[PDB]
Structure formats: structure tokens, C-alpha cells
Scaffold this active site. Structure first.
Site, PDB file in Angstrom:
ATOM      1  N   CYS A  40       0.815  -1.199   0.000  1.00  0.00           N
ATOM      2  CA  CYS A  40       0.000   0.000   0.000  1.00  0.00           C
ATOM      3  C   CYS A  40       0.861   1.265   0.000  1.00  0.00           C
ATOM      4  CB  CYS A  40      -0.958  -0.003   1.193  1.00  0.00           C
ATOM      5  SG  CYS A  40      -2.091   1.387   1.224  1.00  0.00           S
ATOM      6  N   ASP A  42       0.321   3.876   1.713  1.00  0.00           N
ATOM      7  CA  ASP A  42       0.342   4.391   3.078  1.00  0.00           C
ATOM      8  C   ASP A  42       1.741   4.737   3.581  1.00  0.00           C
ATOM      9  OD1 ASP A  42      -1.727   4.073   5.822  1.00  0.00           O
ATOM     10  OD2 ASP A  42       0.428   4.245   6.168  1.00  0.00           O
ATOM     11  N   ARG A  44       3.007   4.939   6.356  1.00  0.00           N
ATOM     12  CA  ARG A  44       3.487   4.204   7.523  1.00  0.00           C
ATOM     13  C   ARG A  44       3.926   2.782   7.192  1.00  0.00           C
ATOM     14  NH1 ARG A  44      -2.019   5.414  10.570  1.00  0.00           N
ATOM     15  NH2 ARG A  44      -2.590   4.479   8.559  1.00  0.00           N
ATOM     16  N   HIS A  96      -1.738  -4.038   4.957  1.00  0.00           N
ATOM     17  CA  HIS A  96      -1.519  -3.652   6.340  1.00  0.00           C
ATOM     18  C   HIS A  96      -2.826  -3.393   7.069  1.00  0.00           C
ATOM     19  CE1 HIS A  96      -2.252   0.759   5.824  1.00  0.00           C
ATOM     20  NE2 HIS A  96      -2.006   0.423   4.573  1.00  0.00           N
ATOM     21  N   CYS A  99      -5.857  -0.113   7.111  1.00  0.00           N
ATOM     22  CA  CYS A  99      -5.751   0.436   5.767  1.00  0.00           C
ATOM     23  C   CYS A  99      -6.996   1.227   5.400  1.00  0.00           C
ATOM     24  CB  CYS A  99      -5.507  -0.686   4.754  1.00  0.00           C
ATOM     25  SG  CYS A  99      -5.328  -0.124   3.056  1.00  0.00           S
TER      26      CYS A  99
HETATM   27 ZN   LIG Z   1      -3.501   1.154   3.115  1.00  0.00          ZN
END
Ligand SMILES: [Zn+2]
Ligand SMILES: [Zn+2]
Lengths: 209, 209
Positions: A40, A42, A44, A96, A99
Site C-alpha cells: 500500500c 500508506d 506508515r 496492512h 488500511c
Molecule cells: Zn492502506
């Protein structure tokens, strides 16, 4: 202020060069990663740091909620270049927990363009509506769908003609499903690895060319 | 052997936790990156390490030769979630020298699916065939096209209705063009930043909704 990022970079590059002055020189000569990370977008979930890889080690595609579609030349170009040219040995499909892309698929708000992108995760939630309904909290539903999505994406990668033709011509290639806990920094194996055609359902198997 | 990556991860997570036991706990509460990185999948260009960012700091899309297409819901979902939801302040379009995707666009071999993906870079090489021809070596042609491609991708991001509507509603949002030297670890500004509608050609500007 973007100059920090620049100043960090010069700092990063020159630190590396005094530890090993050839690091980038060698690295720039050939690209030989053994791994493709499909994860992803993302902020993090950075791939290299998470599994402790150095530049040169991980070919990376990242998109919203690590979705792999069989009409998406974006992801399919990454997979095909990874598999046919770089001949990676491993594809790491990593979703993750927490999400937002998965969470959006589980709620009913229009987010625009990304509504179409997340269709197939929304489909998954419908398919498993009985299983997910059966879970008492939203966070549990979101997190479970996250696992389901990774597991689905692994199937999607493995069913690609790209991957099947790798196998048809005897190429060693494994597809993995993992999920990262943004809460604890742990990268967990979902134990859904696919490494050959025999592991695909008859309906999805393609004949060699 | 994939267990190394797992063993590196546990090692990475537990090291971080003894330096700051709350690092992941805090990080998992909200996603607030200020930056979107749109870069190449190439293993030798990891975003966070290059600009010295920590998990949580950089929303990331990576695909082959950092291509942004206005019909690609993959990249457009990353851009729109970055811009409309995370409300990033900055989009970092980062290409890199020695990019195989660019190089493939400059040669005539069929690589399959990725042939379609790279169409728009092949278009760029045609558009600049006089400029590029005028360069004596293949490495120079490839590297110049790399700059041209980044500069083009920056235009593509800026022309998106996603980005223009951010600006229409007064959102602070800048699009940058950078290029990374895989040979020296340096991340260079191409000085093609776009920060508002006034910087777009009349033919590409969209009226507010
Ligand atoms: Zn995500
Ligand atoms: Zn590249």
C-alpha cells in the site's frame, strides 16, 4: 520547507560514501533485486525499512490498498518487468492493518475516483458479508478485510499470464501474502504462498503459448 | 530464503521500540504525511531513505518509469487520496537516471504488456527526436529523456482535475520535479514546480465545478 528533504539526501548520500565510497557506483551498474514488493501507498508502510532491505534489493509497486487488477497496465507492468526482465524470485504482496482503502470499501462515502479503484475490495466485503457481520467492531471488520484482501491479491498475481508463463517456462517464482501491523512494526506471513501452476484452480489455469 | 526479511523486520521493530516504545503506537493513530512521492519502482530508488524520511512522512506510489496517465485509476487514486483526503502539501515526482523503462521506450524490443505502459515516454522521444538525436551516446539520450519524462509527469499531475480542484478550493499544493542519480545517491531538483492554476496553459485549465 522542501530543502530539509534535499539537505537530508546530501547528508544520506555522503554518509554512505564515507562508509563505502563505491556503494552507488556498484549499485548503478546492474539492477538485480530478488524481491518485488506490492504494497500500500500508506506513509506508515515503507518496504525497505520494514524488512531491512538496502537500495538494490526490492523492486516496489505501491498503490492504495495494494490492489492488483488484470486490466491495470500500471501494476501489471511492474509485475511483468519484475518477473520477465528482472526475474525476481519472490513477489511480496503486503497489505496492512488499519488500511484506509479497505476501510473506505467498508463504508458508503463517495471519495470520487478512488471509488472505482476500491470496487474489488468492496466486492470482497460483499462476498464475506456473513463472516464480517459476525465480527462485533468496525476495527475488526476493517482488519479482517485487510487479510482477505491480501489473500485475494496474491491470487490475482498468481493468475496473471505473466506469472503462469514464468512457471510454464520453468522459472522459480513464489507469490507471498503478508500483512504489516502499523501498530507494532511487525510484518506477518499469511501462509498463502503460491509457487506453481498446480496451486491454481482449473478455471484459472492458462495453457502455455 | 525469505526468513531473513522476517528476521530483519523483528530486529528493526524491536530496535525502534527500545529507542521509543511508542513509535508505532503513535504512528498508527493518524496518517498525516505532508508529501506524496510518485517515483519509479526501481529497487535502487527507495523514497524514504533518499530524502531521509521516517514512516508516516511519505505517501508513496511507485510504478515503472513513474508514469502518470489520466486514465489510470491506480495512480489517480493515489494522487486523489493524497490530495483530497490526506491533503498533502507536496507531490514529489521523482524519476531517475538509468531508468530501464525510459531506456525501453528508446529501443525497439517488445517487452509485452509494458509496451503499452511506456507509450507516452516513447511519444516524448518522438517529440524530442531532434533534440535527442543531437546527443552522441545512448546513455545521454536515455538520461535526457529521463528528465523530459519527469517534467512531463509533473505537467500530467498538475493538469489533473484532482489537483486543479484542490487549487480551486484554495488548497495549498505544490507539484515538484526531481531526478535521482542512482550513480551518486543525489536527488536533484528539476525546477519545474507548479503551485497554481495560473501556471497551466489555457488549453488545459478546467473551470471549477
Ligand atoms: Zn492502506
Ligand atoms: Zn526506472
Amino acid at each position: 520547507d522542501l530543502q530539509q528533504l534535499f539537505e537530508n539526501n546530501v547528508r544520506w548520500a555522503e554518509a554512505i560514501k564515507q562508509e563505502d565510497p563505491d556503494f552507488f557506483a556498484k549499485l548503478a551498474r546492474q539492477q538485480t533485486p530478488e524481491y518485488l514488493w506490492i504494497g500500500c501507498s500508506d506513509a506508515r508502510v515503507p518496504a525497505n525499512e520494514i524488512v531491512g532491505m538496502l537500495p538494490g534489493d526490492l523492486f516496489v509497486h505501491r498503490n492504495v490498498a495494494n490492489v492488483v487488477l488484470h486490466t491495470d497496465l500500471n501494476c501489471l507492468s511492474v509485475i511483468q518487468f519484475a518477473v520477465d526482465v528482472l526475474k525476481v524470485k519472490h513477489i511480496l504482496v503486503t497489505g496492512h492493518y488499519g488500511c484506509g482503502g479497505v476501510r473506505a470499501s467498508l463504508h458508503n462515502d463517495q471519495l470520487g475516483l478512488i471509488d472505482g479503484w476500491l470496487r474489488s475490495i468492496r466486492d470482497l466485503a460483499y462476498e464475506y458479508r456473513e463472516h464480517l457481520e459476525q465480527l462485533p467492531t468496525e476495527e475488526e471488520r476493517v482488519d479482517r478485510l485487510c487479510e482477505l484482501n491480501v489473500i485475494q491479491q496474491v491470487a490475482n498475481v498468481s493468475h496473471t499470464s505473466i506469472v503462469q508463463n514464468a512457471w510454464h517456462r520453468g522459472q522459480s517464482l513464489s507469490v507471498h501474502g503478508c500483512i504489516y501491523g502499523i501498530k507494532d512494526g511487525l510484518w506477518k506471513n499469511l501462509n498463502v504462498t503460491v509457487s506453481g501452476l498446480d496451486q491454481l484452480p482449473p478455471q484459472y489455469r492458462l495453457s502455455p503459448l
